[PDB]
Ligand binder design. Structure first.
Ligand SMILES: CC(C)(COP(=O)(O)OP(=O)(O)OC[C@H]1O[C@@H](n2cnc3c(N)ncnc32)[C@H](O)[C@@H]1OP(=O)(O)O)[C@@H](O)C(=O)NCCC(=O)NCCS
Ligand SMILES: CCCCCCCC(=O)O
Lengths: 357, 358
């Protein structure tokens, strides 16, 4: 019996920041409404592709773990916004990092993708011959947004988070997990016409709908994450009070609060950074984990509950038992190339096109 | 304690519209003579429906074949590089279509090696955790991507889907050892760089994307990648090469398949080939081939199978499957695609005209 210890953690947030005030200059919205309803103050807009965000996050996690790129056997990138479909962006991260041989694939389960990835990498390592793995959640959601619709335009940001996993006999890392999907919620969070269903030669194919029914997402997410968390906790044999930290998906603060309240988990145990970055889909959990560790929220031997949901409607929860070390072995100098533009400047073309159309 | 994931169901979905080599000759400077001689491809299928619809039908056939209830399916993996949509994933669409409650549902992209990646992943998930039954699907609508003015690539690819159902068991069956990987130095020799979030969303000409393709370099890297993976798998199995009963390869090029077998010392007649009927269907190739090998009586109970594949990445893989007792379906499915009211040329008419005009 082995386990997959989380030995490295890292993040990459692009520098360009879009404030609620910035959004109010081109949409009929306010910082007052957004902060009160969502809890989001700011979000980051990438000047580079998803794979570049993923690469920097991975470099930080590798340094943190002190592992050699020659030791990495498996690379999973969880994303719904890959640079390209052919080939996958896991292979681009592999190419960028100079990792020889590793299995490299992209996984799409929306914002639950990082937990899906962590479950998958963990079980691969437990049942087969993978010694070290790199699991990355990375998104450039700004690509997708309709800048005339305030409902969806204020919720999402770009970013990437990463972990490195190391095979061990110590009972650490992901213990039980339950992942799933409520396919009856499929049509309430969707971009139906980007992908091979779109008309390739229609000049207006860029003006797609972002389907979004917020109250239905709320209900299904709470139900989905809640029951998954219960299964995990029940299988662990832990009482609810033994959970030290909750690392949730960062989509909505009231969802996080409701999840904890219905579970009877203390509100102050949930790590929240949505105010800074908004919803970065698959990046939310690994960015949050990385920041929780940086800010001293996770102690050695802590019991963590991870929980997430996403378009699908995918859902999941996991129980992580932390090991001995909460400090990086090394630091990485890795950074994105310099950003010569403001967030409004980056979005200028897309805003003008959506408004004209 | 030690369990295994038996392949208990297999199924396929090939769309009805057939594009012949003659059809291709009416709008490209090519001939059936050249294509059949050079590639061995006679026909390929062009879908009138989205990838998820192909995936759904293949799954229905596999589920009937396995005699499993949709309530028993705990995991759905769709390997594809041509999904209907990115948000949400198409695994969830298959789940919605089939009425599967609760199952983990995700899309996996490792190009044509995706089915083997999927089979490895589902197997290990079942071995290390609480998944009793899984559905693993390779499904593609590659016709979406093609430049119909370029005969080089336009004659090689097709649409389709294949599926398996896996069932947890104590019997030493299903996927035994596997080795999967990626040669990222081959990343730039097979690619469609400008479809995805790297593309200009508001450029009216963003549909006319280029391909990176260096055929001799793909050949070399694919043979090297699959060959060494197959060796690792065989070496870990403790089997001699003569004990392999059937090879189920990726159907990209017949000389690649031949070279793989020759360098491994595997008899050429053990490799199952259906590229002549369907061309390269990326992640669907292996599961369609497996399904057809079973239908045609090529796989016996207790046979040792070698699966091998490669794809853009350059991803690569091999697997050793030990077959169990049953090679016949428990049930048949009536599931079919909706009627196709168009010929393959009619389906491709708009895309052909646009590519020619541009
Ligand atoms: C076995 C192998 C020789 C197969 O070759 P092939 O792709 O079937 O055919 P080739 O690319 O060698 O083409 C041979 C000639 O036919 C011509 N040709 C190509 N497509 C044609 C068409 N549709 N009609 C008529 N002639 C054509 C070419 O001009 C070429 O001549 P050239 O060498 O002077 O350019 C292999 O070594 C190879 O090169 N494969 C390339 C692709 C590959 O290996 N994998 C792709 C999977 S994604
Ligand atoms: C132009 C798109 C064709 C599909 C390329 C991937 C096929 C493979 O992996 O073998």
């Amino acid at each position: 019996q082995c386990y997959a210890e989380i030995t490295g953690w890292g993040k990459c947030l692009p520098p360009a920041t879009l404030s609620n005030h910035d959004l109010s200059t081109f949409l009929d919205t306010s910082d007052e409404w957004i902060q009160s309803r969502t809890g989001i103050e700011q979000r980051r807009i990438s000047h580079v592709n998803t794979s570049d965000l993923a690469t920097v996050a991975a470099q930080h996690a590798i340094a943190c773990a002190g592992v050699s790129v020659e030791e990495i056997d498996l690379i999973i990138v969880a994303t719904c916004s890959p640079d390209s479909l052919i080939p996958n962006i896991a292979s681009r991260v592999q190419q960028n990092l100079g990792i020889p041989s590793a299995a490299a694939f992209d996984l799409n389960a929306a914002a639950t993708g990082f937990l899906y990835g962590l479950e998958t990498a963990t079980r691969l390592m437990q049942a087969s011959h993978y010694r070290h793995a790199l699991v990355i959640g990375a998104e450039r959601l700004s690509f997708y947004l309709d800048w005339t619709k305030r409902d969806t335009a204020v919720l999402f940001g770009d970013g990437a988070g990463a972990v490195v996993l190391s095979k061990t006999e110590q009972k650490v890392g992901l213990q039980d997990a339950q992942i799933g999907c409520d396919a009856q919620g499929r049509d309430i969070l969707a971009v139906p016409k980007f992908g091979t269903a779109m008309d390739r030669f229609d000049a207006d194919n860029g003006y797609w709908a972002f389907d979004f029914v917020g109250k239905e997402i709320f209900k299904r997410a709470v139900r989905g994450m809640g029951a998954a968390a219960q299964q995990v906790l029940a299988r662990s044999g832990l009482s609810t009070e033994e959970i030290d930290v909750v690392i949730p998906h960062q989509a909505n603060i009231r969802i996080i609060q409701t999840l904890c309240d219905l579970a009877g988990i203390a509100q102050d145990k949930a790590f929240v950074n949505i105010h800074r970055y908004g919803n970065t889909s698959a990046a939310t959990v690994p960015i949050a984990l990385c920041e929780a560790l940086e800010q001293g929220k996770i102690k050695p031997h802590d019991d963590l509950l991870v929980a997430a949901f996403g378009a699908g409607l995918t859902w999941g929860a996991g129980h992580i038992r932390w090991g001995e070390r909460i400090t990086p072995l090394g630091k990485s100098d890795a950074q994105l190339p310099s950003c010569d533009h403001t967030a409004l400047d980056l979005l200028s073309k897309a805003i003008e096109h959506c408004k004209r159309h």
